[PDB]
Write a protein that binds this ligand. Structure first.
Ligand SMILES: CN(C)c1ncnc2c1ncn2[C@@H]1O[C@H](CO)[C@@H](O)[C@H]1O
Ligand SMILES: CN(C)c1ncnc2c1ncn2[C@@H]1O[C@H](CO)[C@@H](O)[C@H]1O
Ligand SMILES: [Cl-]
Ligand code: NA
Ligand code: NA
Length: 351
C-alpha cells in the first residue's frame, strides 16, 4: 500500500546460519573466511548442514539492503523488490519471511530449480560463506515492472544481478536515464563482477546516478578501466589522496564528461576509515566528501559481512528523505555499525 520509495532487483537467497566444527570446513574443502560459490564437490553441503541445526534468515545482498529501507520506512510496501526463486519449500520460506516484514515483492518462480541458498558457517570467530544461486539465475525482469514500481524514484541493483543477465539492470537504468529526478544506483558487489562484466558494466555506469563500492571493488574498477596510471594502480586506498583519485576517475564512468541536473555520485566505503565520495554538482564542478566513521572497538565487531549491504540501505533510506550526501553517508554508517555488532545481517529490533 505504499508509497513505494525504493525499487530493487536482486538474487533472493535464504541464509542458513550455523556454528560448525573445523572438520566441516575441511571435509568440504572450504577456506575459512572466504565467500564462494558452491563447487560440485560441495553439492551436499546444505543437506549436511541440517545436522548443525542452522537458522533460516532472509539473505541476498540487494534484499538485505531493501529490508533495511523497509524497516526504516515502516509503512507496508515502502520498498519493492523482484528476483527469481524456485518452486521448492525454501522459496516459500523466503517469501514468507519477506512478507512478514511488509516488503513489496514479486518473486518469479523457476520450475525445477532450487531457491538461492547461502551457508553462513561460523567457526573460530570467522564466517565462511558458500552460496548456490540456483533459480536466481533465471530472473528476467517482467514487462510490467514499471507498474509494480509505480511511484519509486530510487532504483537499485547490485552488480551481482549481472550473473543472471545484465539486461535486467540495463533495463532498470535505461528507464531512469535522462529523467532528472529518477535515480539509478548500483553496487559494484565483488571484484569478479568488475572483470567478468567489464563492457556491460561500462555501459550500465553511463546510466548510473550513484555508484557504491568498497576499496577492493574500486581497486579492480581502476585497473580494468585504467582510471589511474599504472604506477598508481597498486596504491593503498587507505591513503586519502589515492582514494580520492580513484573516486574522481570512477565518476567519469558515470558522467562521460557531460553535466546535467541529474545526480552523479561515486561512494567508496573504506572499512574503519572515512567514507570518501566524489560528486558532480549542479554546475559540473566536482566536490569531494569525507565522512568520518565512528570508532567501533575490535572486540565489539562480530562480523563485517553484510556491513556494505546495510550501508547502502541506510544511504538509500536517507536519500528517500531528501537528506544531503553527507547525511546519507552518516545514515549508511549508522546502519552498518548496528549490523556488524551483532549476529545477522538485519538491523536490530531496537534500532
Ligand atoms: C552472485 N552472488 C555471489 C551473490 N548474489 C547476491 N547475494 C549474495 C551472493 N553471495 C552472497 N550473497 C549474500 O550476501 C549477504 C551478505 O552480504 C548474504 O546475505 C548472502 O546471501
Ligand atoms: C574497525 N572496523 C573494521 C570498522 N569500524 C567501524 N565501522 C566499520 C568497520 N568496518 C566497516 N564499518 C562500517 O561499515 C561500512 C561498510 O564497510 C563502513 O562504511 C563503516 O560505516
Ligand atoms: Cl543481490
Ligand atoms: Na550536474
Ligand atoms: Na551482523
Amino acid at each position: 500500500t505504499g508509497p513505494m520509495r525504493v525499487f530493487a532487483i536482486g538474487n533472493p537467497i535464504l541464509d542458513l546460519v550455523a556454528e560448525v566444527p573445523s572438520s566441516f570446513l575441511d571435509e568440504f574443502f572450504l577456506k575459512r573466511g572466504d565467500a564462494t560459490l558452491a563447487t560440485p564437490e560441495q553439492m551436499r553441503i546444505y543437506s549436511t548442514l541440517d545436522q548443525f541445526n542452522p537458522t533460516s534468515l532472509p539473505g541476498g545482498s540487494a534484499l538485505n539492503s531493501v529490508r533495511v529501507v523497509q524497516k526504516l520506512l515502516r509503512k507496508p510496501g515502502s520498498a519493492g523488490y523482484m528476483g527469481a526463486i524456485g518452486d521448492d519449500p525454501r522459496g516459500q520460506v523466503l517469501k514468507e519471511l519477506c512478507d512478514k516484514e511488509g516488503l513489496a515483492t514479486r518473486f518469479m518462480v523457476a520450475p525445477g530449480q532450487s531457491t538461492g541458498v547461502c551457508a553462513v558457517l561460523i567457526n573460530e570467530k570467522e564466517r565462511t560463506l558458500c552460496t548456490h544461486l540456483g533459480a536466481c539465475g533465471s530472473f528476467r525482469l517482467p514487462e510490467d515492472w514499471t507498474t509494480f514500481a509505480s511511484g519509486a524514484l530510487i532504483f537499485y541493483a547490485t552488480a551481482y544481478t549481472l550473473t543472471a543477465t545484465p539486461k535486467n539492470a540495463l533495463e532498470v537504468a535505461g528507464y531512469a536515464h535522462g529523467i532528472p529526478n529518477a535515480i539509478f544506483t548500483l553496487n559494484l558487489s565483488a571484484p569478479f563482477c568488475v572483470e567478468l562484466y567489464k563492457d556491460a558494466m561500462q555501459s550500465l555506469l553511463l546510466h548510473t546516478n550513484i555508484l557504491f563500492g568498497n576499496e577492493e571493488e574500486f581497486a579492480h574498477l581502476a585497473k580494468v578501466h585504467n582510471l589511474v596510471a599504472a604506477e598508481k594502480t597498486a596504491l593503498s586506498t587507505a591513503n586519502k589522496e589515492h582514494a580520492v583519485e580513484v573516486c574522481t576517475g570512477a565518476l567519469r564512468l558515470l558522467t562521460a564528461g557531460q553535466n546535467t541536473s541529474a545526480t552523479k555520485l561515486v561512494v567508496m566505503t573504506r572499512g574503519h576509515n572515512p567514507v570518501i565520495a566524489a560528486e558532480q554538482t549542479a554546475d559540473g564542478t566536482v566536490v569531494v566528501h569525507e565522512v568520518g566513521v565512528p570508532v567501533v572497538a575490535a572486540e565489539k565487531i562480530v562480523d563485517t559481512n553484510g556491513a556494505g549491504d546495510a550501508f547502502v540501505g541506510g544511504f538509500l533510506y536517507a536519500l528517500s528523505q531528501g537528506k544531503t550526501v553527507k547525511q546519507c553517508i552518516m545514515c549508511g554508517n549508522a546502519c552498518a555499525q548496528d549490523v556488524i555488532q551483532h549476529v545477522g545481517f538485519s538491523l536490530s529490533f531496537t534500532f
